[PDB]
Design a binder for these strands. Structure first.
Lengths: 98, 91
DNA sequence: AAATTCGTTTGAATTTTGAGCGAATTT
DNA sequence: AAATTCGCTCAAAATTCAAACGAATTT
């Protein structure tokens, strides 16, 4: 009765395929494509912040949406994100979303 | 100005970049829509796992398996990296 | 009014980090 | 032959955390 939903098909993105059909592909693939395009435009420059770089780019929308979802309620937001309320307040401050 | 972007196509077959954060936002809007007041519980680990794996995979490819250079690129500790690789069983 | 949330401290648990080391590997 | 990396430890620096609690909001 319940079809298996793989973890990679939980957060998905609309894409267009070779037959102009709209399909959901994992968010993973978005991250992969972003990184591949990032690496290609390096041309051998040295990197030292890739994790923080990727992390900000992902934390900001996550907080944005979860704050919209809870209608500004930091306690619920912290509770559905699975992090301490203080950690959440910290992150929100970090991205000027307070 | 945006270092992390993905490729989009519009109805006129024009390709265009968009910030990765738009993808993340879309995926989440879809997630929240699909569940109807069901409880979300560990959304941060959820998203974080969805992002750490392709990151590790791409940086390990770029450095041809060299964990030390990977860790240096990412700006994390080599131990932290080994740990994360263990976590997603890619070692 | 009642409850919930906010805003903040405080100290404990957990995690990340650096540094050091011989073994194994790459150059 | 050398240099680099790995695999692994120790402990200390940093971060996350669960509690508080009154003030401030919301229900």
């Amino acid at each position: 009765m319940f079809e298996q939903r793989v973890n990679s098909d939980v957060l998905t993105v609309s894409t267009v395929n070779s037959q102009d059909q709209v399909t959901q592909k994992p968010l993973r693939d978005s991250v992969k494509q972003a990184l591949k395009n990032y690496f290609a435009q390096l041309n051998g420059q040295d990197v030292n912040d890739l994790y923080e770089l990727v992390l900000a780019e992902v934390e900001q929308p996550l907080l944005d949406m979860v704050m919209q979802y809870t209608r500004g309620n930091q306690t619920r937001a912290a509770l559905m994100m699975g992090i301490n309320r203080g950690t959440l307040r910290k992150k929100l401050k970090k991205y000027g979303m307070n």
